[PDB]
Amino acid sequence: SLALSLTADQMVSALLDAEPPILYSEYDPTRPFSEASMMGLLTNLADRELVHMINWAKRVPGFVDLTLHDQVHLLECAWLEILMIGLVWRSMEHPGKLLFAPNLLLDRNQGKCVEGMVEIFDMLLATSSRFRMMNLQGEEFVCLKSIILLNSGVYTFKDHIHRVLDKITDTLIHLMAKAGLTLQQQHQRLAQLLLILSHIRHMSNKGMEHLYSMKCKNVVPLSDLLLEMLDAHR
Amino acid sequence: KKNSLALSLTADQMVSALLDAEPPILYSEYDPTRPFSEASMMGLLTNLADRELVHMINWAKRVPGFVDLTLHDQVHLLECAWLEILMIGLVWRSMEHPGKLLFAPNLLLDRNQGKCVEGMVEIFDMLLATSSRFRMMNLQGEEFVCLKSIILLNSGVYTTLKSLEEKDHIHRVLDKITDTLIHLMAKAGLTLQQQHQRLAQLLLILSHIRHMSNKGMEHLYSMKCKNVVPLSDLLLEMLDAHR
Amino acid sequence: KILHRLLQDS
Amino acid sequence: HKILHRLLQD
């Protein structure tokens, strides 16, 4: 494979160059939202982000080497985690708020408009505040997001994927050792980042159940692509 | 509170404390002479998990740093992690039984028998895949007790100024358990590259255990409403903490 | 809570 | 018969 032959810096640059853009929400935002208007802006935004994520995944080293069937399984199981960790990363320099879009910055009080969304909101704000206190670097963020893509669905099927996961691990340690962190601080910071992935998985499971709740209580029509990504978790 | 014993012990002392605190493997009321349905298979499993929860709670008291926390924090951590800890213990006991889950020494279940319960098939396959992974990695008991203690402290720490020092104390114990895992891998002859890789592989499995736990919690909520499998009062209180 | 009590029982 | 198949190829 071509992903294993890369170097730690060439792996960082290839992931940074593959980063999807920050999309905008539908403008003319009426300052107070309703339950349907807020979910309308969110499902529309998430649907367009999914198109960019699918093309971002191809640019992940080692992802094209997998079969078409395996690429489908990994994205279907990881898509909400990847949207969430991206949202969390965008909201780092905005404490107490979630930056869904540059023109859509929401507070936790605005999460009270949709039932069951305040719990997911607080979990997302807590993840962003955790990234801020750790001073998460963008080079580390793109590594964590690729780890989510390749790891979250590999057990519901393997050697190649695990070889790429080890390759990314070598890249995380390389970045931390460049920042001057001691040998003890490197594996301690490596563990702290990877444990947050467990909570990102938890938020995705709680978020997935909430989206399924809106499917049968259809106040906002979900796109067919968003429905197929949602149906794959049942 | 002050002068935490967890922060002033070496790695080999961390292993000894965790190994000495291991709960016992409990037996089931399963009768192999009489096969019965999924409603009774789940009855055995819910009875077993209820008795296992009692030992888990007293096991958590012996985890370094857990007594230092307040009672409200101890309740929260267990309420969110209890199913993950049951599941990683189940997966650990099933390592040396390929294709089967050892719920109890007298209850070794096939995936075909777990299909009797509606929805248990996928959760059985994930637990099997987790057990096959631990077998592939040759997971050691010293690493399992570290991972299980990491689950207890980490799974509920994200869900005023004095509480920040409480979460900081939890991350202090978590960092020291990480040192213990690296200490174990260095003793097994692994290079610094192999230690970091194996450390990542172990912690990434914790993401799948959270996934299995979340999906497993949804099925327990379905059994309660179906009201066909008897659920003890403790399991109902733990299940209400997630819904 | 039973968990609240079981953690308290000593 | 899924859209994700199409976007992964185009």
UniProtKB/Swiss-Prot annotation, chain A:
GO terms for molecular function: 14-3-3 protein binding; ATPase binding; beta-catenin binding; calmodulin binding; chromatin binding; DNA-binding transcription activator activity, RNA polymerase II-specific; DNA-binding transcription factor activity; DNA-binding transcription factor activity, RNA polymerase II-specific. The keyword Cytoplasm applies. The keyword Zinc applies. The lineage of its organism: Eukaryota, Metazoa, Chordata, Craniata, Vertebrata. 17beta-estradiol binds at residues 49, 90, 210. Residues 7-233 form the NR LBD domain. Coiled coil: none annotated. Belongs to the nuclear hormone receptor family. NR3 subfamily. The chain holds residues 305 to 548 of 595 of the full protein. It comes from Homo sapiens. GO terms for cellular component: chromatin; cytoplasm; cytosol; euchromatin; Golgi apparatus; membrane; nucleoplasm; nucleus. Binds DNA as a homodimer. Can form a heterodimer with ESR2. Interacts with FOXC2, MAP1S, SLC30A9, UBE1C and NCOA3 coactivator. Interacts with PELP1, the interaction is enhanced by 17-beta-estradiol, the interaction increases ESR1 transcriptional activity. Interacts with EP300; the interaction is estrogen-dependent and enhanced by CITED1. Interacts with CITED1; the interaction is estrogen-dependent. Interacts with NCOA5 and NCOA6 coactivators. Interacts with NCOA7; the interaction is a ligand-inducible. Interacts with PHB2, and UBE1C. Interacts with AKAP13. Interacts with CUEDC2. Nuclear hormone receptor. The steroid hormones and their receptors are involved in the regulation of eukaryotic gene expression and affect cellular proliferation and differentiation in target tissues. Ligand-dependent nuclear transactivation involves either direct homodimer binding to a palindromic estrogen response element (ERE) sequence or association with other DNA-binding transcription factors, such as AP-1/c-Jun, c-Fos, ATF-2, Sp1 and Sp3, to mediate ERE-independent signaling. This is Estrogen receptor. One of its GO terms (biological process) is response to estradiol. Residues 1-234 are annotated as: Self-association. A lipid is attached at residue 143 (S-palmitoyl cysteine).
From Swiss-Prot, chain C:
It is found in: Nucleus. It comes from the Eukaryota. A motif (LXXLL motif 2) lies at residues 3-7. Acetylated. Contains four Leu-Xaa-Xaa-Leu-Leu (LXXLL) motifs. The LXXLL motifs are essential for the association with nuclear receptors and are, at least in part, functionally redundant. The LLXXLXXXL motif is involved in transcriptional coactivation and CREBBP/CBP binding. It is linked to Chromosomal aberrations involving NCOA2 may be a cause of acute myeloid leukemias. Inversion inv(8)(p11;q13) generates the KAT6A-NCOA2 oncogene, which consists of the N-terminal part of KAT6A and the C-terminal part of NCOA2/TIF2. KAT6A-NCOA2 binds to CREBBP and disrupts its function in transcription activation. Belongs to the SRC/p160 nuclear receptor coactivator family. Present in a complex containing NCOA3, IKKA, IKKB, IKBKG and CREBBP. Present in a complex containing CARM1 and EP300/P300. Interacts (via C-terminus) with CREBBP. Interacts (via LXXLL 1, 2 and 3 motifs) with RORA (via AF-2 motif). Interacts (via LXXLL 1, 2 and 3 motifs) with RORC (via AF-2 motif). Interacts with APEX1. Interacts with BMAL1. Interacts with CARM1. Interacts with CASP8AP2. Interacts with CLOCK. Interacts with DDX5. Interacts with ESR1. Interacts with HIF1A. Interacts with NCOA1. Interacts with NR4A1/Nur77. Interacts with NR4A3; potentiates the activity of the NR4A3. This is Nuclear receptor coactivator 2. The gene is NCOA2. The chain holds residues 688 to 697 of 1464 of the full protein.
From Swiss-Prot, chain D:
Transmembrane segments: none annotated. It comes from the Eukaryota. It is found in: Nucleus. Belongs to the SRC/p160 nuclear receptor coactivator family. Contains four Leu-Xaa-Xaa-Leu-Leu (LXXLL) motifs. The LXXLL motifs are essential for the association with nuclear receptors and are, at least in part, functionally redundant. The LLXXLXXXL motif is involved in transcriptional coactivation and CREBBP/CBP binding. Transcriptional coactivator for steroid receptors and nuclear receptors. Coactivator of the steroid binding domain (AF-2) but not of the modulating N-terminal domain (AF-1). Required with NCOA1 to control energy balance between white and brown adipose tissues. Critical regulator of glucose metabolism regulation, acts as a RORA coactivator to specifically modulate G6PC1 expression. Involved in the positive regulation of the transcriptional activity of the glucocorticoid receptor NR3C1 by sumoylation enhancer RWDD3. Present in a complex containing NCOA3, IKKA, IKKB, IKBKG and CREBBP. Present in a complex containing CARM1 and EP300/P300. Interacts (via C-terminus) with CREBBP. Interacts (via LXXLL 1, 2 and 3 motifs) with RORA (via AF-2 motif). Interacts (via LXXLL 1, 2 and 3 motifs) with RORC (via AF-2 motif). Interacts with APEX1. Interacts with BMAL1. Interacts with CARM1. Interacts with CASP8AP2. Interacts with CLOCK. Interacts with DDX5. Interacts with ESR1. Interacts with HIF1A. Interacts with NCOA1. Interacts with NR4A1/Nur77. Interacts with NR4A3; potentiates the activity of the NR4A3. This is Nuclear receptor coactivator 2. It comes from Homo sapiens (Human). The chain holds residues 687 to 696 of 1464 of the full protein.
